[model samples]
Target chain A: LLQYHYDCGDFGMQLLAYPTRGRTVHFKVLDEFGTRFEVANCSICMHWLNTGEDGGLIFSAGYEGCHVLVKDGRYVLRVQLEEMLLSGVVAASYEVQMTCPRP
Target chain B: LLQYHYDCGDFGMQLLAYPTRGRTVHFKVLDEFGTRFEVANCSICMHWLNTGEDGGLIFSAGYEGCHVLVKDGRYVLRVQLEEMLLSGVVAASYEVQMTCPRP
Candidate 1:
């Protein structure tokens, strides 16, 4: 299992992700709320860079792709998650300043 | 366990939804795909009307609300399902002609 980690707000909205299939990205989002909630929904956008700030990139919506913009410093890793319910929809967005640190 | 169902194309794209908390909506979508791949993500939109089509209402993209529109013929219960992945985003939309049938 490959683990992808992200530190939102530089603290710990930390998220971990792994792929169950080529089409599904199963991930767990952490918070003071509880242990972990695995989320897989439409428009899961994830991007990162290992090089400089100019390595920039992004991807989301009904579409999926990858981009790295570290050498320049626009947005490195962007993560957005959302959920629909009978009550309402829950959503979140994340952006890592620069660099995709190795886990 | 509460279940919400939808029949797309008059066949089956049957979906079952149950709430874990007031804010979390967890459900499974079935097709030629497989069995129960539970999905919980941002922006889950579900609407249905047991009256006329013009009972008009919609809540999505962020906000949460419900409307019954079986009184008019414009449209009725609309359900949108989507998922984000490493490969890409998967999505589907369903609109029940009229009436929010109980399960």
Candidate 2:
């Protein structure tokens, strides 16, 4: 189950949308690769993009396994979601964006 | 893949058991229905369970769409999983509670 409808001002938000809401990505046992949520309904305070369970979503990072960016200050734009960890698990949480240019 | 095996002292933790961890259950949009996440490890505090999206999960509340609780606690006595979103989607996130009974 995979789906997407990103509009993060083009590449600024990073892009991560699957199944729309819950696409299945729950990697248990010390995982740090999936389970992100970002909502800036008015900038209340919340971040996103952090797969830290040992590294990029359960393992791997630096050795060419790059891909990390978790910004927070609760500037929740419109709606955001980043669920990516299929084989590893722990995926879901999308919806938020409308103004992202601070990569 | 469904699962269970809870033991919340007497029920103070109420009772949350399922896939173990991240078993789905998003229920988005003014869904005063379901979106629970309790992480009270060492009493850090993160109680959830309000389902206040105009009231009860994308629709209905008093009419009998009954159900409301999103305790922000990370005690994680053992592990819980509550993925009850199949036809309605958004089901996952279960793990914790060996002391449920503050209802």
Candidate 3:
């Protein structure tokens, strides 16, 4: 029996950000970003997650930059950087791949 | 080191239903369910998770034909039926794969 997670930050229970706050930009997963498991059998998808929690995946664009995050596990996240270097601006994106836990 | 977020949510507050409920969900890395964190580590090519709390997966069909959630870290959802025989209405489905947080 596999569990199906719908929306994290906004899976009907929570609400994260919106329109990435107002950056007028894009958010994608980055590279060299994944997760690790234990003595188990499973692998996560290095993709972007949409949620509305304190630590859940979110995207907010203010006067600063944009951000993309991958919540691989509890209190665990793989972030990315975009917009390279701005006078005071920056952005990020990343992937989220989950693997079986090690023993 | 990464930390970027937007607004309309718990930047300083809280809510429900959106971030999923329960302080724990089940991540059966072994052959079971529940969530937690132990002395477990793995190399690359390994990652699988739906980071959240209480429960991330939900299908409006257990309990009596909706789902049978098992909040090993929270509670065990003994669901499995269909209106006890389905003779009326129905709903949808959900899928969530997380971790194995136990000792």
Per-residue lDDT over A11-67 for candidate 3, one digit per residue giving the tens place of the 0 to 100 score? 111113333433321233233443222111112222323445533334322211111
lDDT of 3 by residue, B1-103 (tens): 1111111211111111122112222222222343322111111222123323643322221121111234655212221211111333322222233212222
- In model 3, state the lDDT of residue A25: 19
CA deviation > 4 Å runs, candidate 2: A1-103, B1-5, B9-31, B34-99
Q: Interface RMSD for every prediction, one decimal?
A: 8.3, 10.8, 6.9
* TM-score per model over all chains: 0.20, 0.20, 0.17
Docking class for model 1 is incorrect
Model 3 bad stretches (over 4 Å) = A1-23, A31-74, A81-103, B1-103
Candidate ranking (lDDT, best to worst): 2, 1, 3
lDDT of 2 by residue, B82-103 (tens): 3664464545544433323332
**TM-score of structure candidate 2:** 0.20
After the best TM-score superposition of candidate 2, give how far the Cα of residue A4 lies from its true spot, in angstroms. Answer: 27
lDDT of 3 at A30: 30
Error of 2 at A96 (Å): 18
Off by over 4 Å in 1: A3-23, A33-35, A38-103, B1-52, B60-103
Candidate 2 lDDT tens digits, A1-103 = 4454333432233334334333443211111344333221111011233443423322111211112233463222333334655565546544433323443
Ranking of candidates on DockQ, top first = 1, 3, 2
